[PDB]
Structures are given as structure tokens and as C-alpha cells.
Amino acid sequence: GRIGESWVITEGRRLIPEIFQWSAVLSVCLGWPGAVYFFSKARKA
Amino acid sequence: MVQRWLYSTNAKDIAVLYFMLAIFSGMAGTAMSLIIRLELAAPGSQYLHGNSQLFNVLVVGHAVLMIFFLVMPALIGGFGNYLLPLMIGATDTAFPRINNIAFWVLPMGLVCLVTSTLVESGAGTGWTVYPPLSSIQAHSGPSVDLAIFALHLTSISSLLGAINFIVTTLNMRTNGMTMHKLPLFVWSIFITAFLLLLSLPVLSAGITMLLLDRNFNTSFFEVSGGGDPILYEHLFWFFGHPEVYILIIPGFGIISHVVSTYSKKPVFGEISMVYAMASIGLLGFLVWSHHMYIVGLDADTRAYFTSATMIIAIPTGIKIFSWLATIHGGSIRLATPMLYAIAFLFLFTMGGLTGVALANASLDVAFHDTYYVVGHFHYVLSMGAIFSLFAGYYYWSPQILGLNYNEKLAQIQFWLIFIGANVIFFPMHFLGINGMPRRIPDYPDAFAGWNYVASIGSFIATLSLFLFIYILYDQLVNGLNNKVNNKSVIYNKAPDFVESNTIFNLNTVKSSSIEFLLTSPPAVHSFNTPAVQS
Amino acid sequence: AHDEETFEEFTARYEKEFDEAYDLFEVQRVLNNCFSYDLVPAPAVIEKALRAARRVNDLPTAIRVFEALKYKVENEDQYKAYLDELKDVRQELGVPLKEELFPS
Amino acid sequence: GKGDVAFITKGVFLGLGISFGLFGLVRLLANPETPKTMNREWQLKSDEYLKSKNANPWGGYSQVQSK
Amino acid sequence: TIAPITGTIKRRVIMDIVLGFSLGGVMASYWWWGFHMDKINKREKFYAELAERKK
Amino acid sequence: ANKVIQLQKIFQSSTKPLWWRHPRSALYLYPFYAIFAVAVVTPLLYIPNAIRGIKAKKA
């Protein structure tokens, strides 16, 4: 705003830690076929 | 008690019976899904040794039983019969004997469908029961006749319920309900009851044409003799797409209400949302042959239908965008129907995106009668209609049944069905794009992994339903003790921030529809006097 | 009115709505309807809200104004430059905050 | 309230373990014999036949999937 | 001395839908470029080597 | 033959249910109960003969 820490910084601080956990929950809500393929005998386990 | 449950022309005591046949048939259909996915777990003839006709019988039983005896009762019949008179202030519905005969001709369709799977090995065609696979030369016996008499009876039940619903919310509204002031579930049941009597006459005409060219020697689809089996594909899918739009539109209504009441915010633009839903209804008839891109239509009419199914896709998109807008900025109280409402958005957006991947008539030649299609509809039908069904039960049954459930068991049931149903239908997409066809007993043993992963998931999805059965029991014998002894949640709408507890106990329920103002289990004559509104 | 509300019309409408309340339900109701809008209100609104909570003679809604405001604002520099503008009203009205009342 | 998030994640992982064990002991009673082309010895011949006729040349063509 | 502080949900949603656009864009951009250009380059390498081997 | 108000004065002033309230309504419901019980219990003894597969003795 006018006086205070700037809105770019005070919403980047709120949202930049949220992007990594969004990527984590999407990489484990769509990426568990990779985790089940990784242990099977098709990958010469 | 015989006149209160067998004659019983009162729309509150018909919905409980609708729900009882719904939970019975859903248990039978998921036993069939367990048997199917238990036999498809590994290549080579498993538990049912050989006998592909038995697997065809099991898959048509699972499909048609769980569509026309779980989802359509427990969404149209049960929920509409209990809530459509109770939201517009009618004392109960118009034509009461009509929605008593609708319920009472449901389970005789159920018992003839059950006894159709026993005589002369059995009807195996799949739920889209096609000629000349079902004509008397390639399929002899009285099995598929009883299997489609079940569809005649369920068709009659749903049409009688549709006429009942249409007149009982076109005339017996309360004092101040105008033509656009109804809550959105009333509008969903309205438009669904229109699509029923605009669609299923064509279905019943086509399947009685199938019956009287089976047994009465006519030649509608017997091809050596003049007819053609493409006419059945037209006459079936002209109902077959409006049928699933019928099955999913009250899901949209239920999800709209629960995200409206668990985020302390009205829905973002209710008038544009009901215009989108009504245009989805009146547009869902014009795209009936997107299930027939392979059979030999011209490229011009295929171009028309792949143009029109994307304009089918757009108002569902603006509905999901309005749902994100009405949960944005709220005060979201994450209880167990709000969890199902949150999961429905993601797990139906996923199926709708793979549906518009299917909707290209160009792209449907690589995906037809293939497990990609199963991954699409077992998203948007299963997760869609039944996550809305669970977000209907866990949200309404403390008011209807009057017994509060257990909360932590409801959340482990939600997470178990969410995990254990996301692990089933997600490898179906890889099975589809790798080349697995539908309705095979089992398969060439290349793709031997994803079927095993889906089968280890279906046991989780069945164990969660066993825990839902225990939730029903714990609600039925420990309702008052879950009211008192601090195991449940009691107020679905939390008190606001600057409001005291002594001030919350004045205005306990901040509703926007009538249903949460009636007492737990409501009186048999609730609206003695009309319920005024400005 | 679905037409937008400017800030001066906002503060005048709500000052004339805080002046008229007489019960406790009315003060908490108009306080919730003032705080659940999009903007944070200028202290000309909230010192009148403190007077209107003084007229009904109950304390904790003259404290939850301050905590709802701390949830409203975007940082704490806005909160401190806000709270030194309502200093003497908080002094002679004698209401506390939260962080000094419940130290945790 | 008061550690019930721990109770519900304990219930979720216990349900996963219970369903895994019951799927295992339901899997145990299915059928004694396999189709004969399931072990690795058949699979090496069945993809030697594939590389004789260069099927799936850029993507994956090797089929083993058995221990 | 205080300025009127107004418009935080509008700034938040037009800061959020832009990052949603760019986030879905970088995920789909990785998909198209990485995976699809991997498959297309493998296929064109095989077809060039086949049309060279048949001289 | 203008016998509607006598029937109304009879039909309002009784305790019996509506399908039993008429004077001549004994001749309409006892044979109906008999033939309905017969006609609906009778295919449920022919259904196990169909499950076993044994057809009729015709011709």
C-alpha cells in the first residue's frame, strides 16, 4: 500500500512457499504411477 | 405400520424407502465391480474359470444395476422426493400415488433384473444392449427380455417421478417463490425432470422395438430382412447422453448448496449458473451421436458433432469457475461434506478434460471402446455423482434422520474412498492409450501391471464402503450420544467472528433454504400454514 | 444497490448505521456487516463502533474490533500506524488488546 | 480438535494396510497355475521374435515383467 | 494521516489468476517441448536413418 | 340418476377407508383380492422351473 512493506513483497512472502507445496501435492497426485513403476521388474529391479 | 410403509402416499416416507433400495442395489453393484476387477487382476483365467459369458453377465449387471438402481434413485427419487416439497413450501408433492408407484415399480425391475442373470446362461451385451448381439439368432433365451423389462420398469418409474416433480414445483410453491427465486437444487430437479420426459420415451420405444424384433419376428434391426443395427445406435444414444446429464445435474445442485453453506457465501451469480445449467439441459439433446464416431457417419456430420460437443463443454466450465469464485474469499469450514465437495471439483474437472479429449471426432478413432473411455466415465459418473451423493448424505441426513454421525470415521471414509478410487481409474487412461479394448474377460499379457494396480485399489474402494456401512450403523444406534458426547460436529454453519456465543444461541441456523429450519426428523405435516417469503 | 460504493458514501452510511443501534445484536450485526466487506474501514468508522459498543455496555466486542482489524490489515506497520490513531479513545474507554491480555 | 488429525491419518494408513492384507489373502486362493507364457524364459523369446521384425523401433519393445 | 486501504481481494485474484496461467503454462510447456519433442525427434531420427539405410 | 348428493352425504359421513366406503363395494374387492393373489403368486412357482431350464410339455 502507501505506508508499510510493499504489497509485492508481502504477497510474495505469502505465496512463494505455497508454489512448492502445490508442486509437491500435484507431483504426488499424478506422479504415483512413476513410483509404482520404479519398483516393478520392468525397470530391471 | 402397514399403512405407513406400504400404502404411504407421503413424500417423506417414500424417500427413505428409495434410499433403502439405493443402498441395497449399490451394495450389489459394487459386489459386481469387486468381482470384475478381482477377475481382471492378472492374465489367465482367474476365479471364474473360463466362462466369458458369466463375465459379460457380471459387467452388464454392474453397469445397469449401479446406474438405474443406485444413482438415479438416490439422486432423483430419494433426494427429490424428500427435498423438492421441503424447499418450496409444499406440504408434500402433487400426484402422491404417482411417486408411490414409481418407488414400488423400482424393486420389481430389480427382481426381474436379478432373475434375468440366472436363466439360460444369461444376458451379456453390456448396458448398451445392442443388436444383432441381442437378437434371437446370436443370443437365445428369455434372459435379455427380463433384462430389458427391468429397463421398461425403471423407465416408467423415472418418468412418473419426472411428471410428479415438474408439476409439484410448477404449481405448489409457497407464498413468495417467484419463477426465479428457487434454490438451485430445485432448479436442478426441475430441469432433470424435463430431460427425463423429453428423453426416455425414445429409449423405451427403441428397446421395445428390440423386444418385438427378438420375439415378435419383426425386422427393425435384423439386417437380412431389411433393417439395420445403426438405427438402434441412434435411438439408444439419443437417450444415452441425456441419461448421464440427468444423472449429473442434481449433482451440480447438491454441490452448489454445500459449497454455498460451508463457505458462508452465496453462490457467485446464481442466475448465470442456472442459465448455464438450463442451456446444458436444452443443449444435451443435440450431441447424442458423439458415441458413434466410428460406425460410418460422414465427415460432415462428424464435423458438426465435434463442433457441438465443445459448446456442450463450455457452460460446465463456467459452472466450475463460479464454484471456484464462490469458495474464494469464504471462511471454509472443512467438515466431511465440504471435503467431498472440494474433491468433486478436481475429480470431475479431470474427467471433463479427458472427455473433451475424447470429444474430437478426429481423436475418437484412437480411443473408442477402449479403457480411456472407462477412465473418463468412471471419473465423471462415479466420482461426480457419488461424491455429490456422499456430500448430499453427510450434509442432509443429520436433518432428515435426526441422528448425528461420527466425524473422524466420516473423514477416514472420505480419504479412503478418495485414495482408493483415484488409484483405480487413473491407470485406466494408460491402459487406454496403450491399446486395451473394453469388455474383454482378460487380455494379452503385455499390460499386466496397471490392471494389478487397479485391482489393489478396488479393495480400498470396497473397504471404504464397508466403513460407510459401519458409519450408518454408528449413526443409527449412537445418534443421541454423538449429539451429546462430543464425537460429532453439531453446527454446520459456524458462528461468525464478532458474534458472541450467547448471540449465536439466538440465531442458531443461518440458512438460505427451508430445510435446516425444520426440526430433526421433521413433522409429518410440516407446513400446516404456508411459509411466507418476500 | 448493486452499483459500487465509494469510500465517503461507505463511511457516511456506516456511521449513520452505527449511531442507530440500541441492542447488542444490532451492534455485533452491523459490526460484522462492516468488517465482512472488502476494504478495511477508516478509524472514523471504528471509533464510532467503539462508542456504539460502549452504549450497550459490554466489553469483548470492544476488543474483537481490534482483533478482527488485525486479521483485516495487510501487515503490522499498517496495524501500528492504525493503533496510534485510536490511542486516546482506547485510553479513556479502557479497552485492552489481545497480545498484552493473553501473552503467548 | 486435539490431535484428531493424527487419529484420521492413523485410520487412513490402517485402512490401506487392512485392504492390502485382505487383497493378499484373497489373491492367495485364485488359481494354482499361471498361463505358461508368463515367466521370463518365455518373455526373452517373445521379444527376440520382436527384434527379429523390428517392432516398436524407437519406443519400448522389451517385454519381461516377471521375476 | 491514514490513507483509505481498499481493494485487496481484487489485487489478490488478479495476482493469482496470472500466476495460475503461467504455472499451467510452464507445466504444459514442459509437457509439449520435453515429452513431445523427445518423441518427435526420436521418430524423425529413426525415419532419417531408415531412408538412409534403404539408400 | 341425480344420486350424487346422497352419495356425498354417505361418503363424507363414515370412518371406513375410501375403497371400502361404497355400499356395493363388496362385490368389487373380494373377487379382486382372490384373483390378484392367484395371478401374482403364480409365476413365482414357474420361475425355478425356468432356472432349472426344464421347458413346457407343449405338443
Added chain:
Amino acid sequence: VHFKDGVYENIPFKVKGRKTPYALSHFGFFAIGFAVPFVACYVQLKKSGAF
């Protein structure tokens, strides 16, 4: 006659005053519901092969 209303007079099950436990009826309902496809499988597996 308006039928009298309560917390357990809205459902066909009688729950409180019985002779048998409620778990018998409540789990036998879904036992027969879950075992109708198994008896269909049995009557279909004795008609063609063995079992």
C-alpha cells in the same frame, strides 16, 4: 390420521425396543445385498463347468 413423529419413527427399522440386536438386521441386509452376485456366480458356475 397423522402418524406420530419422533427420532426413530421415521424409518422402517425398529432400533431401540427389540429382542434381537440391531446389528443382525443391519448387517444381514447388506449381507444379502453383497451376496446376490455371488449366488448369481454360483448358479452360473454350476450350469456350465464345475463349482
Added chain:
Amino acid sequence: MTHLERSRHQQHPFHMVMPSPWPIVVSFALLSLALSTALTMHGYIGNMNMVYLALFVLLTSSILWFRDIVAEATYLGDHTMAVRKGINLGFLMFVLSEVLIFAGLFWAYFHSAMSPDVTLGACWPPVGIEAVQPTELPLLNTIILLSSGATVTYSHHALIAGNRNKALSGLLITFWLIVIFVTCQYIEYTNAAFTISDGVYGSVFYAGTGLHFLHMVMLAAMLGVNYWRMRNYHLTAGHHVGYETTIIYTHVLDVIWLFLYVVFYWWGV
């Protein structure tokens, strides 16, 4: 008036129906009919005696249901104007569902007609099948429906007016007019060169005209019931919803007959 004798009434115009045992019985009969006609089509039971008694018990249960509804409508006296508009709109939606079954039959006719198969000789009507000419008997039983509509509409407007000898004469002659229609339709069926099995032309032709045939014999039963309760003074001058119902039904049956007749007898020959 007094509150004490105002609170002794219904407090809302809508119907509150006492618990009646005619959904459960007619649903039992529908189940028995469906199973017995699925069971006798394959020679499991010996004769058609059991499908006969199943159809008969369905018919007599439904006529006892209509007895209960005419007793409740004109004796107990509950059908006020809100309930009358309700049952009127319900019958309108039911007939809108019936005309869509007729539209499905017309879709079958059009799809197998305007794209004729190569086994029919690639011409509609097919080779050898002597089609019915539209000008002999079809002209009589397409003018008889217009005359039936004219006499049922003057019997209606004489019922509203007040004369009894005209409003009864119109109903008697429209009943005998459409039963003369039904009898000459059966006369048309019993000497025709093709049966219901002879090709796809006979199949869809007899399907459409036979569904209209069964619809007007049900209309004739409805009009016989309406003439009986017009003779026995049930029908009033301003509360005849069960007669406006059947005149709406016979006029839409007339127009769906002319659609069926034109594209089944002129364009399709």
C-alpha cells in the same frame, strides 16, 4: 368469518391424499405381467392363459384406481382450482411424453426409408410389396377423425352452455364415430398384402399404425367412462377437468394421426 371455524379446514388448497393401496397392487400386477410375458414367449409355460389373467388383473386394478379417483374428485370434493390446474398440466406433460414415442417411431420410418437398404431393392416401398393406396379407406378414416373432433368440440361447448340433450348427443356420436373408425381400421388390417414380418416396411408401418390403434381404443374407453359419468350427473358446468383432459387427448391424437397418415400413406408409397 370466525377464526374458530377457519382453522377447521385444509389451510392450503393442495391435495392431501389418504393412504391408498393402489400403487402396490398395480405394481405387483405389472411385475407379474412382465415376468409372465417374458416367460411365455419361450415356451416355459404352456398357454397364454397366465399372460391373459396378468393383463386382466392389471386392467381391473387400474380401473379400481380410477374408481377411487372419481370418488375422491367428485364425492369427497377436494379438486379445487389449484389441484385442477395441477392435474391439467400433468396430463399435458404425459401426452408430451406420448408424442415423443410417436416421434421415435417416425425416426425409425424416416431412417430406414429415405436411405433404403440394398436388400429392399433400393426403393421405398420395396419390391413386390403392394403398398396400401391412401385414397380408399385411409380417406374415410382420416375424415372421420375430423368429424369426431368437430362433434366433441360442440359437445364440450354445449356442456359449458347448459343444454343436456346436445352435450350428450355429441358425446354419444363421437363414441360411435371413433369405434366405427377402429372397426374399419381392423378391416384395413385384415386384408393387407403385407404382414408385420414382411420386410422392414411392414414392420415399421404396422408399429406406427398399431400404436395409434391402441391409443385410440384407450381413448374410446376413456370417452365411454366420461359418457357414463356425464349421464350420472358427475360432470358440472365449470369443474369438468376429466373431460377437458380427454378432448385435449383426442385432438392431439387427431393431429398425430394426420402426420402418421400423410407420411405413411402418401410420401411412403
Added chain:
Amino acid sequence: DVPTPYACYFQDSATPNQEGILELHDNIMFYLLVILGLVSWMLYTIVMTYSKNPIAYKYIKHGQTIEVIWTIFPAVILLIIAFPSFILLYLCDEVISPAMTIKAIGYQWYWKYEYSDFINDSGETVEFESYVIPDELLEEGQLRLLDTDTSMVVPVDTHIRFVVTAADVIHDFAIPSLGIKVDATPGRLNQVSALIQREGVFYGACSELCGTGHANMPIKIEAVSLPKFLEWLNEQ
């Protein structure tokens, strides 16, 4: 060509039609993953920053600007998605000037292939019924349930258009490698084209329900070079 265990992509290219289908599906998925990512990101951001929000902005119920932008954005994306599928649909029916024709008539639980372009100078048409090898007479390397004792064999680098029909229940001639899938209904012949660009085997299955023997009904198409195909057709 053949399926692979634990695969999550298409059976790879043989025809220009299958190459176009693969490119179109990747373009459609590239346009869909933006929407899926922003929908999942909106849902995640909302349910993890407004759950710990004590008040609710209940006075936000409509706004016309953002409403019309989220109803005009899916129309734009669906036009861009529908723009190349028209090109593929109108080119995959272009069967101008094929070389030779096949009939692929499908009976109950087998196929019957027949060539009748009259260059077989024994004079006749050539037919063969193409039964599945039953799964005990497999001999140490043969793919289960999708092998065939008598394969269809086609040439490379010629446009071949084959019609398909049945004599019974509706079948489907379906190979996912050649991108060919067409329902063999018993009444009409349905033609589709192909240009196989490399030698090798291609496997497929029946993809419509036939009854008991639906699984035991495969398609095996070996594509050989043109002199070897001429030698095979003259010898057989």
C-alpha cells in the same frame, strides 16, 4: 506396434494418420494441461488460504468483467483446439487413388481376409480364415492372446483401402498402431485407408462386443516390402 508392460503412451507410429493423431493428442493435452494446472492451483490456493480466514466476504456475489472473461476464455481455447481437428478429420477421409484393396470380413470369433485385385495369376481371389492360436499350442515365444496362425500381410509404401463388414454380430476392425478403427456392422461395407511406412508386425484386437469369444479374436498384420509381397501373393 505391439503393447509393452507399464507403458503410458501410444503404440507408436506407422501411418500418416496415426502420426497426425499423435500430434493432435499432444497439442490437445498441451492446451488442456494449462487449464488443469490453473484449476488445481486455484483449488489449492483457495482451500489452504481461506480455511484459516475467520471472516467471509459475503458481499461479493457478481461481477460482469471477470464473468465474461471466464466465459469467453473457454470459447477461445476450444476454437484453438477445434481448429486442427477439422483438418485431420477432413484429411483422414481422403482416399483418392489407393493402390490395392482388401476385404476383412469378420465372422463369429475369427476374421476372414481376402484379396481380389487380380494380379494373382492363378486366376482366383485369395482368402484365408485367420483363427487365433489356442493358448496351449503356443511354442516358446509367441505373444499370448494376440498372435495368429495365419497373418494378414500387406505391402509397404502403397495406399491400401480396405472395406470391412461382418456376417453376424457387429465387430470392429481395430489396430491402434496403424490408427485404424472401424465398426464392421453386418449390413454395410465401411472403407478406411492406410499408408504403412515401415516393415514389421502390427497387432490389434476386436473392439466391439461379439459375445463369448470377444477376447479370442485378434488382428495380426505383417507389412513386408513390395517384391516379397508379390512373391507371397503369387505363391499362396
